[PDB]
Ligand binder design. Structure first.
Ligand SMILES: CCCCCCCCCCCCCCCC(=O)OC[C@H](COP(=O)(O)O)OC(=O)CCCCCCCCCCCCCCC
Ligand SMILES: CCCCCCCCCCCCCCCC(=O)OC[C@H](COP(=O)(O)O)OC(=O)CCCCCCCCCCCCCCC
Ligand SMILES: CC(C)CCC[C@@H](C)[C@H]1CC[C@H]2[C@@H]3CC=C4C[C@@H](OC(=O)CCC(=O)O)CC[C@]4(C)[C@H]3CC[C@]12C
Ligand SMILES: CC(C)CCC[C@@H](C)[C@H]1CC[C@H]2[C@@H]3CC=C4C[C@@H](OC(=O)CCC(=O)O)CC[C@]4(C)[C@H]3CC[C@]12C
Ligand SMILES: [Ca+2]
Ligand SMILES: [Ca+2]
Ligand SMILES: [Zn+2]
Lengths: 680, 504, 78, 23
């Protein structure tokens, strides 16, 4: 044998020539031929009414695909096995599914698929409304964090079916047409559904993209729903609705970035940000800088008026959120400026004083440290503990405050434990004064690096700062890989060099001086020398041995050279490849991320909790019924126009497929035969 | 036939394979479309390698065959059907067959991965729903008890304590915990926990090294069994297997040299006056190199993690691009090393110095010899070679200028040109690898997962050294299931996609 | 309870079976049926001429969407 | 989809009157 004898292996049962003509008449829309053949079948029992084409299409399915309502009615007049024809009509999005609804095995749909679930998948408003008008219900899925005995038992029996059924239910519930129809509050339903779908993607490692797409679709629906507001009164009603912008705060907690960054939503927020401050967005940039500078210089007098004279014209200026931000920023700059003055030695503090009294500059630095702690305490008071620890900057603030407390405690300890004359060069090296200065210096770095969080307010540094933060997570991933490589070579280099590098009597012991002696004596020294070789600060004589062991020296330098190639040529250049690719993904929708972050910064100054800056902070049924009606009224309009604008128009702008061409031939072919039948 | 008409023969062969690779023909006339698609994709991939021309056409045909198998498996709607298909053989025999055929899309199917995760976490419910802090705590305490779990497995088979280790997830944790203890012991060896002196020419093994030895024997013992239960072709396919062989070879040389030094040198001699080729010196050198390889083996464990997994796979797939520039850079490096050594080998014959080379404060002879020239040129990438290395004791400023210009030209080519060109590749390379990176990681994670499914390596490294009726029934139940899959695949993919085709 | 009882919350006012047929005739371009139904509306006051489909399309809007100038002229006659 | 929906209308408008004219 030299040829492949192709043969039918599975295929399907063949069709009689009469049956093939009968199905061909259904495809061609020949009503007279189909009616005659069906009448002959019920009187001669020759052909099978429920014959199946090679592609798996029966007579009813062919008529449904061509949307020949007359043919469907003719077939339904006889005893045609409907089977899953209703699902096929729903999937094909044929509005003439009413005939199958009120009409007194191998399936292309899973057994868990119901007409309502499939209708919601198709996102057809007319079909969904038709089914909901009748008796229709959807099985309710269990929570993401569920421990039901039935849930685990069902998954154990069939894991594939359980996952598919759960995905199908959530796909049906996430359809905007179903939410706009059967949901009491579609804005709240979309917020909760996106949260649940996002949690499912994290829990279900498989089908992560499907769940993420469903959550993104829910987030998009809420943004499109809010896009239908045409008056500022409607926007205020929706955003302030609660069961203060309570609904806007709810959207923030659900990470509805698209909803928050809506142009109308941002415009209203900017009005609250610049309340009673007209023309700020139209002034020159030089005027803006001058006005902000003079306002910031007068932050203490504004806080003094707020404390002394409430509800006063001078005390009402600070209540503006924009003025709060400027005054708070000006307070932080003064604190940072005082930190620079502390290192500048404005007042004499001597050098040999073991326990020094606090400097005059440090004396008025202390209220800011107490104010920062006082403000952080109130952050956990008015706000929830879950939200307090969510922010990354909150952890950074806690570290800075902890370092400041240790500095104050060590300064107090040194004051009350050391009161004798002793030159600095002959101290303990673990002196409380030395540790206090070290922790103060570290806290100064964190205090000055806190100004990055203020970049969100600016329109130019805002999107950049957010992008760098979102890209820092990629650096953390290479910290694991580099450290594993760093520890691998540090282990090898220390193992080789710890015999010879036992030299004593030198001025130094390590790498941090002119004569770098013991680069790989210990594991700690090996790690430092390997770390500093990235920047080229480790010379080549660190691999030398006093003994004339050139083979050991060559191996050590080759191991040092291999690390340099891997870390610098390979790892560093690989790191660049990620962040360049990472930014291309982050560059798009970077405005949405910044606007969401800027909104959170803006609403942090809306309330009265932190009106005072850091240094000076230490010194029903009828109304509820009315709001529900006015929210439902407004929401009725939004859903109605959303359906007309998005659901209807997008379907009209949909592209043309082969089914439409196949359809157009059927109407011509149906008009083809009866005109010939009528004329002849 | 090819000699008579090469163009016709190539076109005829491509047309035949294009016809055979059509999913409609496979779903119709093939006895086992899953096996036919696996074999056809393998054959088409081999043809692309052999036929340099029409490589894209053959690669597209193989990709189409791989896509058909993934779409065919996408039609399973019950877990019983998936188990029947994946366990079918002529253990997941069909899944293993797909792995050997590099059916990454077939392996990384969400339903296929879900069943594999169930086997990975068998009798361990709620692991995927627990908090990350709980996961870390549970893994840590389980890993700390790896010796007691292995002891129970050896002492008490089919016992409640001895059945916990049989879980593949527990095997991975216990094996990982075993490797970390071995790596921790390697750090202790360099930390000099016990006194080993310094002038002992032939030293007895340290107490720390005494219990290090079982791991080395266990690693060799486990590697031997890897070639026993598994095929030799599959044993050498894995890159990490070659890395393990190098690490084991270095450890054997260290043990052999330590034994040789013990039985050949037993006299007092300070270390600074040794041979420089002493067996103790070579043993320490090879032990240090093996320590680097042993600790770098932890990269292969990154595949299990969902975050470090795709990253690690991408870097490995990108390392091949670095190897391509190793040829180009070395050619440039050897070109300038030849020129610099030719110019500087007359003058740089100085003697009587403390040093001879570049690895000290006074870098004397950077280009005396070809070996020294290569080292000095290599170290100039990181800026560790100073500018006085191009100076001559003689007042030959023209020769010095030419040598520094040749040194300067190499620096521009290697750093400004070659290094920046290398960045351009990997940035473009990642953009290609960034897509379908999840499929590559999931395929690699699957191979790691099934490596713990069988009983071949249940014990960790330190403790490893201490019919017709049934066949007929399986064929019918596989064909039954396969009949349903093909029937619904034709209706869902072949029919519906044609209806959604564009209008011409 | 373990199932979600989907119900109509806002939707829109329902259509009479005669009104549904009247709008269906406008969509299908049946000039004779539309003219007869419109004539019956002005003599029997049974169906609403300005009935609205679930999607928010009235009889005039449906004819405009299909660009049936004859249907628009017929509707504008009444 | 509007163009396809349109093309059906002209056929459907020509559908009924020809039937009305013949019958
Ligand atoms: C996830 C990542 C994991 C790690 C992946 C690593 C992939 C492999 C990376 C390469 C490692 C092998 C090469 C190491 C060579 C070495 O250390 O070599 C170091 C030795 C050091 O010599 P001494 O010991 O005498 O100082 O150099 C020599 O012996 C002289 C010959 C040098 C030839 C070097 C050839 C390769 C250089 C590659 C540099 C590329 C620069 C590109 C821009 C100009
Ligand atoms: C596949 C790749 C193959 C190789 C391809 C090579 C392409 C050509 C690459 C450039 C080579 C020619 C330039 C070499 C100049 C040189 O060696 O110059 C080296 C000499 C060294 O002088 P000494 O000998 O006195 O030290 O410099 C001088 O004589 C003084 C004038 C310097 C002018 C340099 C102008 C070009 C510099 C390019 C640097 C670009 C830096 C960009 C970022 C800032
Ligand atoms: C050593 C001390 C004195 C600090 C020196 C630097 C500061 C003067 C700089 C550093 C970061 C700057 C900030 C970076 C970003 C912004 C946001 C941006 O805000 C606005 O445009 C106003 C609010 C808004 O409309 O959103 C411009 C001011 C501000 C606070 C900047 C004010 C000046 C700051 C604090
Ligand atoms: C000096 C010694 C003590 C080593 C120090 C570093 C180790 C403690 C680190 C380095 C790499 C880490 C591994 C990197 C990746 C993974 C995969 C990942 O696996 C899982 O999440 C569980 C399995 C799965 O579900 O796939 C997390 C654990 C593990 C083994 C990590 C365990 C801890 C390791 C071995
Ligand atoms: Ca804070
Ligand atoms: Ca191996
Ligand atoms: Zn439950």
């Amino acid at each position: 044998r030299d040829r492949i004898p192709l043969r039918i292996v599975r295929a399907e049962s063949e069709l009689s020539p009469s049956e093939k003509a009968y199905l061909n008449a259904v495809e061609k829309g020949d009503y007279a031929s189909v009616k005659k053949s069906l009448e002959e079948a019920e009187i001669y029992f020759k052909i099978n009414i429920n014959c199946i084409d090679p592609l798996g299409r029966t007579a009813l399915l062919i008529a449904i695909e061509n949307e020949n309502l007359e043919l469907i009615e003719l077939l339904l007049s006889f005893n045609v096995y409907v089977g899953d024809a209703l699902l096929h009509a729903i999937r094909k999005e044929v509005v003439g599914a009413v005939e199958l609804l009120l009409n007194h095995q191998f399936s292309e749909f899973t057994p868990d698929i119901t007409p309502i679930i499939l209708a919601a998948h198709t996102n057809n408003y007319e079909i969904i409304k038709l089914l909901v008008q009748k008796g229709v219900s959807v099985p309710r899925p269990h929570e993401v964090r569920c421990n039901c005995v039935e849930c685990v038992s069902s998954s154990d029996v069939d894991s594939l079916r359980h996952s598919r059924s759960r995905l199908n239910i959530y796909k049906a519930l996430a359809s905007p047409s179903l939410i706009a129809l059967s949901s009491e509050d579609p804005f709240l339903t979309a917020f909760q559904l996106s949260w649940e779908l996002q949690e499912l993607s994290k829990v279900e490692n498989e089908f992560k993209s499907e769940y993420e797409e469903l959550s993104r679709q829910c987030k998009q629906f809420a943004k499109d729903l809010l896009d239908q507001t045409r008056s500022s009164r409607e926007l205020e009603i929706i955003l302030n609705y609660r069961d203060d912008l309570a609904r806007l705060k709810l959207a923030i907690k659900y990470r509805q970035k698209e909803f928050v960054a809506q142009p109308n939503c941002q415009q209203l927020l900017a009005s609250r940000w610049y309340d009673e401050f007209p023309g700020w967005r139209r002034r020159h940039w030089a005027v803006k800088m001058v006005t902000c500078f003079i306002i910031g210089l007068l932050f203490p007098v504004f806080s003094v008026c707020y404390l002394i004279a409430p509800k006063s014209p001078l005390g009402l200026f600070i209540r503006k959120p924009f003025i709060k931000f400027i005054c708070h920023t000006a307070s932080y700059l003064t604190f940072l400026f005082l930190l620079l003055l502390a290192s500048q030695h404005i007042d004499r503090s001597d050098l040999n004083r073991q326990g020094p009294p606090p400097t005059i500059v440090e004396w008025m630095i202390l209220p800011w440290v107490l104010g920062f702690i006082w403000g952080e305490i109130k952050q956990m008071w008015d706000g929830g503990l879950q939200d307090y620890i969510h922010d990354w900057w909150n952890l950074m603030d806690f570290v800075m405050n902890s370092l400041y407390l240790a500095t104050i405690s060590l300064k107090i300890v040194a004051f009350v434990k050391y009161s004798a004359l002793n030159p600095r060069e002959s101290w303990d090296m673990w002196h409380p004064t030395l540790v206090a200065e070290a922790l103060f210096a570290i806290a100064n770095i964190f205090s000055s690096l806190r100004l990055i969080s203020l970049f969100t307010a600016n329109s130019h540094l805002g999107p950049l700062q957010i992008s760098l933060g979102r890209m820092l997570l990629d650096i953390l991933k290479f910290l694991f890989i580099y450290c594993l490589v760093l520890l691998a070579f540090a282990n090898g280099l220390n193992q080789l060099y710890f015999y010879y590098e036992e030299t004593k009597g030198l001025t130094c012991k390590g790498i941090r001086c002119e004569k770098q002696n013991n680069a790989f004596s210990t594991l700690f020294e090996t790690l430092q020398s390997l770390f500093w070789s990235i920047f080229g600060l480790i010379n080549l004589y660190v691999t030398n041995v006093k003994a004339q062991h050139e083979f050991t020296e060559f191996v050590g330098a080759t191991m040092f050279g291999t690390y340099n190639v891997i870390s610098l040529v390979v790892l560093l250049n690989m790191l660049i490849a990620m962040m360049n690719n990472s930014y291309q993904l982050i560059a798009d929708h970077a405005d949405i991320e910044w606007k969401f972050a800027r909104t959170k910064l803006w609403m942090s100054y809306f309330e009265e909790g932190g009106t005072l800056p850091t240094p000076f902070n230490v010194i029903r049924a009828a109304d509820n019924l009315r709001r529900h009606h006015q929210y439902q009224e407004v929401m009725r309009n939004l859903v109605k126009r959303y359906v007309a604008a998005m659901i209807r128009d997008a379907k009209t702008e949909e592209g043309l497929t082969e089914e439409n061409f196949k359809e157009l031939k059927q109407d011509i072919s149906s008009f083809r035969f009866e005109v010939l039948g009528l004329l002849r």
